[PDB]
Design a protein around this ligand. Sequence first.
Ligand SMILES: Nc1nc2c(ncn2[C@@H]2O[C@H](COP(=O)(O)OP(=O)(O)O)[C@@H](O)[C@H]2O)c(=O)[nH]1
Ligand code: ALF
Ligand SMILES: [Mg+2]
Length: 359
Amino acid sequence: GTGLQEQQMSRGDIPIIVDACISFVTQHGLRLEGVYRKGGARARSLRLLAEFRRDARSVKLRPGEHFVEDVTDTLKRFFRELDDPVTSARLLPRWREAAELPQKNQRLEKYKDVIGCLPRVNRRTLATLIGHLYRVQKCAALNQMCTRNLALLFAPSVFQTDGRGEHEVRVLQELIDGYISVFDIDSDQVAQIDLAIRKKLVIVGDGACGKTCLLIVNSNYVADIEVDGKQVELALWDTAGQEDYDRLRPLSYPDTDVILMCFSIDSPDSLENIPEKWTPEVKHFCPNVPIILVGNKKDLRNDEHTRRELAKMKQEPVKPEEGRDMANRIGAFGYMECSAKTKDGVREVFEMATRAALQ
Ligand SMILES: Nc1nc2c(ncn2[C@@H]2O[C@H](COP(=O)(O)OP(=O)(O)O)[C@@H](O)[C@H]2O)c(=O)[nH]1
Ligand code: ALF
Ligand SMILES: [Mg+2]
């Protein structure tokens, strides 16, 4: 193997895995809302990564055949699993020092100096990645991925941080925003680019499937709920859906009394990750804790735009019976659908969770 120097290299002297994923996402993904925030179905996307590891130049990514979210996941996993972060562990002191200078122009010039000390393959790979993220955020009116969000999603794999690394998020954000300057992009490329009872609740589920909005519309938070005569102080613990936070998420699990396990009705992949990812993790850290399987964004089930996007990959919104079958398959206490956006079903979600916690 997973070393940067051991990879099959493109004509451009960067790893083919990086070149191929970035090219595909650039062609077919710059409009996808939540690109790089949403993830693919675990087993399917890990197969694609394994193909790239076996023989990267043999993988031909084709629209309609490969999921954008599998490819974005593959790119992040590539950087996360390098023996050494592409930014170099040995230069992390200089990165941090650069990040603490007072004025942005001074930080950019220092970042430029650090990048200059990297090995050639690292520099060219980092340049290609940052230029890609620069293009992504320029399309944020469509994909909703501003520079700050991309930096939060990419800093853990790029720098190989624990998951909370504050200096590295600033660097990445400023590298993206300052891409043209830091990487000496000439004016021709600039033009070409222009074209009494207390109970603990934890919520888990795929990135962007609506966990935080569900906690917010109802309300670490606290909600006071009354069910069956009993007044309950429900402690709400929010968690991140991305793989990058897998090491930090178990901090939230101790003492949990009920789990909200979420998928989005507009994402069959997020339902498929219920048995593949969330159920094994939750049953390992929260044995014998009741699970409410929650289908979020119910308002999108018959939404025309949603139905058209999923049909491109021969998918359709999750049906109520599919969620119920899944709830039975994993041994959930119950199944419930809701829309944080319209508030429909939100009370029923937390009332069922509270009854589960009290049984
Ligand atoms: N249509 C619709 N969109 C939603 C709903 N809930 C959340 N969203 C959107 O989905 C995106 C991610 O939501 P968020 O709760 O932050 O996702 P989280 O990553 O799981 O915490 C945001 O753009 C929300 O506005 C919903 O019930 N209906
Ligand atoms: F993508 Al999230 F909480 F913002 F899982
Ligand atoms: Mg969230």
